[PDB]
Amino acid sequence: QISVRGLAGVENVTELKKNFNRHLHFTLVKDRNVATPRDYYFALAHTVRDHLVGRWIRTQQHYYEKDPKRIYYLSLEFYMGRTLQNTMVNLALENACDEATYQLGLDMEELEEIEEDAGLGNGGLGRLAACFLDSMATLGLAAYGYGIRYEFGIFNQKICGGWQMEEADDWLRYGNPWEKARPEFTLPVHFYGRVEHTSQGAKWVDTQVVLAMPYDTPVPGYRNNVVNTMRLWSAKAPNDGYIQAVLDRNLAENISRVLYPNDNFFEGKELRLKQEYFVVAATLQDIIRRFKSSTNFDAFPDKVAIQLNDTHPSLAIPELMRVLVDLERLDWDKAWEVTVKTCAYTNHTVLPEALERWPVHLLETLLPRHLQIIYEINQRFLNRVAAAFPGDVDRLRRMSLVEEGAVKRINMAHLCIAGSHAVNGVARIHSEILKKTIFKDFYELEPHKFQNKTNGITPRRWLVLCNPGLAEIIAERIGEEYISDLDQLRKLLSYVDDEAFIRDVAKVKQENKLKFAAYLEREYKVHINPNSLFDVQVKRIHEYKRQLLNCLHVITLYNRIKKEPNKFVVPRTVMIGGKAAPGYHMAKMIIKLITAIGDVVNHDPVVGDRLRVIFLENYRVSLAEKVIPAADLSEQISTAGTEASGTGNMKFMLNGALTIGTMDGANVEMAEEAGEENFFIFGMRVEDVDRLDQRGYNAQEYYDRIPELRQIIEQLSSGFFSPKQPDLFKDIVNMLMHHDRFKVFADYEEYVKCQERVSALYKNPREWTRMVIRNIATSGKFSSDRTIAQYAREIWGVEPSRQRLPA
Ligand SMILES: O=c1[nH]cnc2c1ncn2[C@@H]1O[C@H](COP(=O)(O)O)[C@@H](O)[C@H]1O
Numbered sequence: 001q002i003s004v005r006g007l008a009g010v011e012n013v014t015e016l017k018k019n020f021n022r023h024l025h026f027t028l029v030k031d032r033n034v035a036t037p038r039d040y041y042f043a044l045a046h047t048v049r050d051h052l053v054g055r056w057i058r059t060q061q062h063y064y065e066k067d068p069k070r071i072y073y074l075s076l077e078f079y080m081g082r083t084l085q086n087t088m089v090n091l092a093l094e095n096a097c098d099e100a101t102y103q104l105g106l107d108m109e110e111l112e113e114i115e116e117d118a119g120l121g122n123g124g125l126g127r128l129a130a131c132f133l134d135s136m137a138t139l140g141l142a143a144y145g146y147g148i149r150y151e152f153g154i155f156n157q158k159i160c161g162g163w164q165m166e167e168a169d170d171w172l173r174y175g176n177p178w179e180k181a182r183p184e185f186t187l188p189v190h191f192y193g194r195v196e197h198t199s200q201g202a203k204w205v206d207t208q209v210v211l212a213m214p215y216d217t218p219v220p221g222y223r224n225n226v227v228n229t230m231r232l233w234s235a236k237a238p239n240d241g242y243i244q245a246v247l248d249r250n251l252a253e254n255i256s257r258v259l260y261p262n263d264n265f266f267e268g269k270e271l272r273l274k275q276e277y278f279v280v281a282a283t284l285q286d287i288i289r290r291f292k293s294s295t296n297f298d299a300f301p302d303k304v305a306i307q308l309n310d311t312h313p314s315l316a317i318p319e320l321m322r323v324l325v326d327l328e329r330l331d332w333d334k335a336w337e338v339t340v341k342t343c344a345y346t347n348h349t350v351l352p353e354a355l356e357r358w359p360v361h362l363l364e365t366l367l368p369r370h371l372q373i374i375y376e377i378n379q380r381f382l383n384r385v386a387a388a389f390p391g392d393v394d395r396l397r398r399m400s401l402v403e404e405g406a407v408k409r410i411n412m413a414h415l416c417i418a419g420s421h422a423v424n425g426v427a428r429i430h431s432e433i434l435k436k437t438i439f440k441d442f443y444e445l446e447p448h449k450f451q452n453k454t455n456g457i458t459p460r461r462w463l464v465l466c467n468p469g470l471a472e473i474i475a476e477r478i479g480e481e482y483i484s485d486l487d488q489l490r491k492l493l494s495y496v497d498d499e500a501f502i503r504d505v506a507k508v509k510q511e512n513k514l515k516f517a518a519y520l521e522r523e524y525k526v527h528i529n530p531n532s533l534f535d536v537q538v539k540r541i542h543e544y545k546r547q548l549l550n551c552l553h554v555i556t557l558y559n560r561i562k563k564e565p566n567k568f569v570v571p572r573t574v575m576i577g578g579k580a581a582p583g584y585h586m587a588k589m590i591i592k593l594i595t596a597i598g599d600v601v602n603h604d605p606v607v608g609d610r611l612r613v614i615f616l617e618n619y620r621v622s623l624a625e626k627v628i629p630a631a632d633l634s635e636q637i638s639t640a641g642t643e644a645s646g647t648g649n650m651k652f653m654l655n656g657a658l659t660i661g662t663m664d665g666a667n668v669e670m671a672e673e674a675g676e677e678n679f680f681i682f683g684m685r686v687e688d689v690d691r692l693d694q695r696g697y698n699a700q701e702y703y704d705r706i707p708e709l710r711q712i713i714e715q716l717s718s719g720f721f722s723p724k725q726p727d728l729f730k731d732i733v734n735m736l737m738h739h740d741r742f743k744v745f746a747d748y749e750e751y752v753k754c755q756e757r758v759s760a761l762y763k764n765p766r767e768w769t770r771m772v773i774r775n776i777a778t779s780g781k782f783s784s785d786r787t788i789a790q791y792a793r794e795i796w797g798v799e800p801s802r803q804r805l806p807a
């Protein structure tokens with residue numbers, strides 16, 4: 001083969017084949033007679049990687065020569081997924097490699113399936129960073145992703161007896177061909193110790209040292225020959241009875257061992273704090289070294305931007321202060337000016353339990369100098385507040401970085417706002433919520449700081465890579481330029497009454513569904529009807545995301561079928577997938593409920609092929625790339641005001657699914673772009689949630705007034721979905737009835753009603769597809785290229801460029 005996958009030139013195909021064989025022989029030390037598919041994968045990976053290095057070296061050389069302002073994206077998570085196909089796509093090598101491997105008697109698709117996901121993230125926040133890296137490279141920005149090389153990423157999810165089981169994601173077991181270890185650039189990171197005051201300033205002494213060893217991964221831009229770097233730090237013990245001392249090196253190296261999988265509830269664990277400082281301290285030394293290798297820190301903000309991916313790397317603020325004040329001997333006010341102008345903070349949630357509030361005693365022991373600096377920041381900040389709002393004593397306590405109580409805590413979000421020149425939310429409604437609610441006081445003090453940067457996804461991974469069929473039929477009409485200028489998809493509006501294009505869009509979808517229906521049987525032995533509506537909700541398991549509301553609809557459909565069995569209903573395959581954080585009991589119960597519903601629904605002979613409930617095990621980037629192109633209906637049903645943006649929603653929109661959604665996060669802007677008539681909008685708006693909270697949410701009211709909902713709750717309570725453990729779901733019912741923060745019942749009626757309208761439209765394939773085209777055509781805004789261009793211009797003060805570097 002297809003046009004968008006590039007040229008398969010005889011010269012390149014020949015050279016790829018020989019370098020494949022060279023790597024198989026010299027690199028893997030194998031002959032064709034004993035080589036396994038995995039060996040073939042690695043030979044291909046090494047072959048493709050060879051094409052990156054020249055561009056990688058010259059990109060970084062170019063930055064050294066031109067000395068542009070550098071963008072440092074600090075994140076504890078980079079949810080990269082697989083790299084092989086992405087690299088081929090960005091290098092225009094896909095058809096060539098397909099041809100080369102075909103001629104070697106190999107199927108490239110099979111080889112691609114061997115690659116492990118780089119699962120160095122939990123979900124949306126981690127994947128956003130990955131999309132952002134792709135866009136920054138595509139937009140020719142001198143950008144670096146900085147993070148941690150976890151030995152173990154997000155756990156692999158196994159489902160046993162309907163329950164989530166976690167297993168270590170040993171993603172590095174067979175090696176990682178994409179990374180280059182840089183042991184020569186290893187940097188010390190300090191912990192514990194104590195602060196000593198001398199005649200000339202404070203000194204941080206008697207510290208324990210952990211070494212930070214960088215591993216660099218290339219980030220190729222889309223066909224622009226730009227290759228940027230993602231630098232991930234690995235923890236190493238310094239080299240200085242005997243046996244135990246050597247074995248105790250593990251303690252230091254545990255810092256980079258495992259990604260914390262808790263994306264729901266802030267856990268004030270010391271190891272997590274260590275990870276956060278570790279990335280910050282090592283990264284800032286690299287930044288400063290690179291800045292010096294071009295005394296006068298006045299130009300620092302002109303040459304450096306640091307983007308904080310939430311508060312996780314918030315220690316960058318006091319760490320920069322520490323370096324500037326304690327080591328470079330700058331005065332406080334100048335260092336502060338430099339820090340503020342360098343740092344910018346992105347918030348990704350308003351959920352209070354997720355916000356980082358570090359106990360003072362933990363910072364006191366681990367980072368005594370940083371605590372002192374935070375206190376000083378706080379005093380000076382509060383003096384500003386007091387001068388701006390004299391006599392407003394409650395404002396002072398509300399805005400303080402130090403939260404008083406049983407345990408004193410540092411509010412890291414407050415630290416970030418104080419120490420950043422820019423604070424942004426990730427969707428217009430979220431950014432407004434920031435200014436109206438949690439950060440209202442800060443907005444009132446410094447309104448200029450507060451911005452919106454609506455999230456986006458990369459159309460490379462999220463269209464070209466995962467849905468080549470759709471990419472192709474689009475390119476056939478409007479050319480290939482849209483891949484790096486997604487707004488061009490608007491040109492597809494002129495094809496909404498084009499019978500050929502309607503047929504093509506629908507054909508691509510059917511092929512995707514057949515392919516995914518085949519994947520399910522082959523890899524999991526489950527049977528689904530490919531003619532059914534593919535109704536999918538894939539995302540991390542959270543109460544706010546309301547997988548439970550989806551469950552309620554599923555049961556409603558089931559009960560309605562059971563009551564009127566011989567009545568026609570639009571057949572559905574309801575697919576729900578996502579991981580639960582290991583300590584999130586309710587989320588684990590929700591997974592069990594879904595499987596328990598499936599166990600009943602899928603084996604009812606009266607239901608037949610009309611309703612299927614599938615829990616998609618081990619949802620991750622590589623699975624998203626498979627299921628999203630196959631989806632008809634995208635479930636984006638978080639309680640209004642809770643999903644900061646969502647990005648899964650955008651992936652579904654780009655890939656030809658219609659959206660059933662609340663007016664939450666980016667759904668609002670999506671409905672705005674596509675038009676509300678082309679979106680299945682339901683449920684309370686933020687204002688309606690607010691009204692209900694004022695009045696008090698009473699779930700019993702809904703239970704008493706909707707008999708269909710009563711029946712479901714009675715089924716859940718009585719053990720209909722768990723015959724051998726009748727009270728298995730007691731917690732869920734109890735939560736729903738008595739302590740539901742997310743008002744599942746309040747949106748139930750409108751949700752079910754809206755779902756009926758979905759089914760109605762699906763009965764008319766031509767009009768379904770026409771609405772799909774209207775979604776795809778208006779999905780342009782949600783390219784992360786747009787997002788990054790806005791960050792670049794409005795926060796970082798740099799101009800994006802689509803111009804190629806010489807090959
Ligand atoms: O001292 C230098 N002389 C020449 N090139 C340098 C020097 N320092 C860094 N570079 C270039 O910058 C790249 C990596 O620099 P880094 O990102 O600061 O680690 C190298 O591949 C070099 O091409």
Ligand SMILES: OC[C@H]1O[C@@H](n2cc(-c3ccccc3)nn2)[C@H](O)[C@@H](O)[C@@H]1O
Nearest residue numbers: 124125128348354426643644645646647
């Ligand atoms: O901005 C990218 C995405 O971030 C998601 N998110 C937020 C977090 C998170 C987790 C812990 C603390 C703070 C934030 N993890 N993922 C957040 O839930 C999504 O709404 C958003 O689309």
